[model samples]
Target: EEAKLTAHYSFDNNDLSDSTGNFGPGTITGNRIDNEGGTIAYADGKIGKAAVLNGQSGIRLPDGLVSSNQYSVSLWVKPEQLTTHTTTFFGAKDPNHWISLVPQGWDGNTMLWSGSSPWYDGRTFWKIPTGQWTHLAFSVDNGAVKVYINGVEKFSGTNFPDVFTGANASFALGVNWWDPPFKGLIDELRIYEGALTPSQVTDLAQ
Candidate 1:
């Protein structure tokens, strides 16, 4: 069995100076910075950051992280300032199984991006709401990837290529593979090593 680890942190404390580095292979970008009480935090290499566009920065994970079929990612977000752009992107190095929380412009909701086809395929996309402290999560095992919001299943897909060609892929936060990346905020982020149950997700949603 893979080890089960519980990691937690809040940007409310400044002592987490080296939280990102200690996690090994982590990144933080966007207007987020290391200072006294903020909207982000991390522990055991798990990443959590406050993404504010025009903030001139974001975070990135340590390169080269690989996983088997079982894995999960969770986050709390409040999307604001939707411009005709994808203001925030969260993904691992492979770029195939990325989650694009698309604030597709003002009065826009977020979208989920996956790799059942080309990266730009429309069938590979879906929408989500913005400006609420929404809870988001994703999990994969075997050939399927699952997405959750507020402890409920919002999306599911299969036929995804391995997140990376091989080996673990680096995780990226707040930035996407485009010019002038996403500008938003992310909070209470977590990743898990197994297929999380709906109850588990619900607890976190609360």
Candidate 2:
């Protein structure tokens, strides 16, 4: 079960260190770092501790993440305000390609990337209540994607976009290039090399 995990950010060390050491430590980015208290901080997590994203700045993650189409990510999120517009919670991108997960909002959840559209925003699926901890996991198996909420597999389709594989592929926790930043608490973020199984995802939620 541990073998497939590519990176783990428990955020318990009061910094952006990945416990697995597979990637370098994350850096807080954006212009708001001068006033870090209002932008990014730490708090008691679902476990030890968690990163609090006030949506002012974001934690810039190391590149080379999600290089393939067989990856998955899971995290515990307690959103302060779920939006109606696109608000990025976790994402990666370059000029020509990208992959992103919009926080659960009035329009449900949408996966945006460098793909063609008629993006079927499942308005009824992928429900996430604000101001509460919810286990959210997304899997992409060769471009087919699945959204799992609190251990239940709710959505899956093949139209998800392929992420950037070139230089300057940006990965971050709260901010993105085109959307509003995520305002919430995120904890126990786990990225896996391969798409996690149904049982595996549920266990991680626990």
TM-scores for every predicted model = 0.66, 0.83
What are the per-model numbers of colliding residue pairs?
A: 24, 0
Q: Model 1 misses residue 83 by how many Å?
A: 4.6
Residue-level lDDT of model 1, residues 1-206, one tens digit each, is 43233333233233322233335533455542221122233322113444343434555554543355566666666655444435343455443454454445233434455442455222223345555566776666665777666677766777654554456554555555542444455665566666777777787778
| Deviation (Å) of 119 in candidate 2 | 5.1
Candidate 2 C-alpha lDDT tens digits along 1-206: 43189899899897889999988998887622112333568999898889998767677778776677677888888888775544444454543444555665445664332322323342325556778888878777776778777787777778566564344467777765655567878898788887888889889888
Runs with alpha carbons beyond 4 Å of true place in candidate 2: 1-3, 31-38, 86-89, 109-124, 165-168
Enumerate residue pairs that collide in model 2: none
Task: Kindly provide the TM-score of model 2 when superposed on the true structure, using C-alpha atoms.
Answer: 0.83
Candidates in order: C-alpha RMSD to true structure: 6.3, 3.5
Off by over 4 Å in 1: 1-10, 14-22, 28-55, 83-89, 92-109, 115-130
